[PDB]
Design an enzyme around this catalytic site. Structure first.
Site, PDB file in Angstrom:
ATOM      1  CD  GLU A 150       1.465  -5.709  -4.182  1.00 24.06           C
ATOM      2  OE1 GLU A 150       1.352  -6.876  -3.755  1.00 24.06           O
ATOM      3  OE2 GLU A 150       2.054  -4.794  -3.560  1.00 24.06           O
ATOM      4  CG  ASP A 153       4.384  -7.498   1.441  1.00 27.70           C
ATOM      5  OD1 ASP A 153       4.887  -7.227   0.352  1.00 27.70           O
ATOM      6  OD2 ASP A 153       4.335  -8.629   1.917  1.00 27.70           O
TER       7      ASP A 153
END
Ligand SMILES: OC[C@H]1O[C@H](O[C@H]2[C@H](O)[C@@H](O)[C@@H](O[C@H]3[C@H](O)[C@@H](O)[C@@H](O[C@H]4[C@H](O)[C@@H](O)[C@@H](O[C@H]5[C@H](O)[C@@H](O)[C@@H](O[C@H]6[C@H](O)[C@@H](O)[C@@H](O)O[C@@H]6CO)O[C@@H]5CO)O[C@@H]4CO)O[C@@H]3CO)O[C@@H]2CO)[C@H](O)[C@@H](O)[C@@H]1O
Ligand SMILES: OC[C@H]1O[C@H](O[C@H]2[C@H](O)[C@@H](O)[C@@H](O[C@H]3[C@H](O)[C@@H](O)[C@@H](O[C@H]4[C@H](O)[C@@H](O)[C@@H](O[C@H]5[C@H](O)[C@@H](O)[C@@H](O[C@H]6[C@H](O)[C@@H](O)[C@@H](O)O[C@@H]6CO)O[C@@H]5CO)O[C@@H]4CO)O[C@@H]3CO)O[C@@H]2CO)[C@H](O)[C@@H](O)[C@@H]1O
Length: 608
Positions: A340, A297
């Site tokens: 990401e 995350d």
């Protein structure tokens, strides 16, 4: 004689710190059964093992090694007994804390650590031998929060399934929809259900919300037996700020920087022992629980100071993540490691050897934003916004991109995927079928948060299960069947799953049809050819011409507007052939009827 921490701990290179630190069953030098305890607290002046065994009194004094690791032994304690450490800090503070390396914790709001054996029966050696990163296989990930997928009938924190019951209910749904993997929102212990697992207190403590360590191990074993992989969401950027968890651990800023957002603290990657903590927390899921990968995350908040490349790259964070991905690949080379970074500043999925960060896949945040922005656009404004959809394929080969519609997009008033789309109920339904057609036939592996496959209208609330009653409506029932069919085509057609990251396997057919809002391309994996065409306008196109360089047959594989999926199309023709003549360089025309807002997939068989 207490086991010593490996010197790699102080190098930031230890991936199995949990074999020494925490609470472990053992025999003392006199052969007495009990539990040994070890905790890293180098600035502490004293630490006691506390628990039920002496009625939460003064407890058992621990001995400090010159390594800063405290050790102690308590004879005769049973599995499941509660304990904590009383830490006398450098600053003169006294704090009773959960074991930071606890393997089990009492149900929130309790933080007492529980004695747990971590010796689990697996029978998945076959699954493990066959395991693959899926570069050239279908990777179709169901993202799931373990507490809010489905609740127990007649009960919803009294009505949570145990991990074992969850596996029994979930696996048939995954298989029916051709999902290859479940990605679990973080199961590390956390005090606040509404953090969804993203504010972590117990990095080694699989959350007691849904049962015991052996129950989660059984969940993973069950998935493996049925050919389903398990990806664990992992929070290495920051930890919950709770004063009795990791913050100010030894009466100094030990885990956190010695001086930003949420109720969290940022991990100090320049602290070697913190790097070993996080290496070991990631490895725990792969090692003890046989997980098939890690999604990390908020990696941009680690890579850049304050998450802003303009403030500078955090070179300590970059080295930490490179070393983490290196060590996970050394131990589990067929695990899947994802992140990401919407900044696109660093090469997230390039090999570390070529100055990348060495992740396997990166969520395509641009694809998600641009696609949803486009389908939210009024029909009249789409001709001007045509290249909003073509843009994704201009940068696609720059990273190993994974097309993700995640939990973050269906919360906080952002609306569910269907509710984002422009138009009437009927137009939203037609466009939702075309949006997922696009997601499954655009190259790149797939991730969808639970509810996407139901065409959910209500935003995700972790206090509620999914609206399973939606399937009493034809639209939602037919939609989840359509979603399963996209999964089946993706899983069975080499054109779609093989060579997704090979630019020679993608070819535009119609990429300038602005007035019509039509896009068409070939997927050419493994030398097979599938034509994908979508109409994003609210008017049908009769005999829309698609220009080919060779004559060919086309056999319909999918019609997003078929009666099957509650669509408006009744067309019967599924077999087409090119006519001679087209445009300069493309001397053949395949003429296709395109329903309003509709998509079609064709198997292409070239003439010989
Ligand atoms: O054909 C095979 C099919 O057979 C069965 O379905 C039949 C069904 O059992 C029967 O009730 C009927 O269905 C009708 C329905 O009764 C009508 O009311 C009408 O439904 C439309 C509705 O009036 C509209 O408002 C709209 O409903 C939307 C809402 O606007 C959304 O906000 C959302 O609301 C849900 C909310 O998000 C949730 O949190 C929760 O609160 O529940 C809310 C809904 O209860 O979603 C709904 C649904 O999209 O659109 C409705 C049309 O979809 O028209 C229905 C269809 O004529 O007839 C059915 C056919 O015989 C069987 O049960 C199915 O499994 C099977 O596939
Ligand atoms: O073989 C060598 C050959 O290669 C190149 O051309 C090929 C091209 O690469 C390839 O993609 C294909 O082209 C197809 C195309 O992909 C299809 O989408 C289709 O394009 C036509 C489209 O369907 C029509 O609607 C029409 O486009 C309109 C727009 O709809 C209007 O909105 C308007 O847009 C203008 C806009 O208003 C202005 O504000 C500004 O943004 O500029 C826009 C002008 O572009 O007008 C356009 C144009 O009327 O026409 C599209 C075709 O122009 O069909 C294409 C085939 O005709 O095949 C190509 C041929 O092989 C290379 O470019 C060639 O030079 C070379 O000879």
């Amino acid at each position: 004689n207490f086991p010593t921490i490996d010197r790699s701990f102080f190098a930031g290179e230890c991936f199995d710190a949990y074999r020494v630190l925490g609470a472990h069953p053992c025999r003392d030098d006199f052969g007495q059964e009990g539990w040994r305890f070890a905790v890293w607290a180098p600035g502490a002046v004293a630490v006691e093992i506390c628990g039920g065994f002496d009625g939460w009194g003064p407890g058992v004094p621990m001995q400090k090694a010159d390594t800063g690791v405290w050790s102690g032994f308590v004879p005769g304690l049973a599995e499941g007994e509660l304990y904590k450490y009383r830490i006398h800090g450098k600053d003169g503070s006294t704090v009773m804390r959960a074991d930071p390396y606890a393997f089990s914790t009492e149900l929130r709001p309790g933080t007492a650590s529980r004695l747990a054996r971590m010796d689990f029966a697996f029978d998945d050696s076959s699954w493990m031998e066959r395991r693959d990163k899926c570069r050239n296989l279908p990777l179709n990930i169901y993202e799931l929060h373990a507490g809010s997928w489905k609740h127990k009938p007649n009960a919803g924190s009294d009505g949570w399934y145990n991990y074992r019951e969850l596996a029994r209910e979930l696996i048939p749904w995954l298989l029916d929809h051709r999902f290859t993997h479940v990605e679990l929102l973080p199961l590390a212990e956390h005090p606040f259900d509404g953090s969804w697992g993203y504010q972590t207190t117990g990095y080694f403590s699989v959350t007691s919300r849904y049962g015991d360590p052996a129950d989660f191990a059984a969940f993973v074993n069950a998935c493996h037996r049925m050919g389903i992989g398990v990806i664990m969401d992992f929070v290495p950027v920051h930890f919950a700020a709770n004063g009795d968890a990791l913050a100010n651990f030894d009466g100094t800023h030990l885990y956190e920087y010695d001086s930003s957002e949420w109720g969290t603290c940022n991990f100090n990657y320049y602290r070697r022992e913190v790097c070993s903590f996080l290496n070991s927390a990631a490895a725990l899921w792969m090692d003890v629980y046989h997980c098939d990968g890690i999604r990390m995350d908020a990696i941009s908040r680690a890579l850049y100071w304050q998450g802003d490349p303009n403030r500078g790259v955090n070179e300590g964070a970059v080295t930490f993540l490179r070393n983490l991905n290196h060590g996970l690949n050394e131990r589990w080379p067929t695990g899947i490691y994802t992140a990401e970074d919407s900044t696109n500043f660093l090469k997230v999925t390039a090999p570390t050897r070529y100055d990348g960060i060495g992740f396997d896949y990166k969520w395509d945040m641009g694809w998600m934003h641009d696609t949803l922005d486009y389908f939210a656009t009024p029909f009249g404004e789409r001709p001007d916004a045509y290249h909003k959809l073509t843009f994704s394929m201009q940068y696609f080969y720059n990273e190993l991109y994974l097309l993700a519609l995640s939990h973050d997009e269906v919360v906080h008033g952002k609306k569910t995927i269907i509710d984002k789309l422009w138009g009437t109920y009927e137009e939203k339904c037609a466009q939702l079928r075309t949006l997922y057609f696009y997601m499954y036939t655009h190259p790149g592996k797939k991730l969808n948060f639970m509810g996407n496959e139901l065409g959910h209208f209500r935003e995700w609330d972790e206090k509620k299960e999914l609206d399973w009653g939606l399937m009493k409506y034809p639209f939602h029932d037919s939609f989840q069947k359509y979603f399963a069919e996209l999964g089946r085509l993706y899983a069975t057609e080499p054109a779609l799953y093989d060579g997704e990251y090979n630019p020679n396997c993608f070819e535009w057919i119609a990429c300038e049809s602005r007035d019509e809002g039509v896009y068409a391309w070939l997927r050419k994996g493994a030398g097979q050819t599938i034509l994908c065409v979508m109409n994003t306008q609210n008017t049908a196109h009769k005999k829309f011409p698609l220009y080919f360089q060779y004559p060919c047959a086309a056999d319909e594989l999918l019609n997003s507007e078929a009666a099957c999926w509650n669509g408006a199309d009744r067309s019967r023709t599924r077999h087409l052939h090119t006519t001679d003549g087209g445009v300069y360089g493309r001397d053949y025309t395949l003429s296709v009827d395109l329903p309003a807002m509709g998509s079609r997939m064709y198997r292409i068989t070239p003439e010989a």
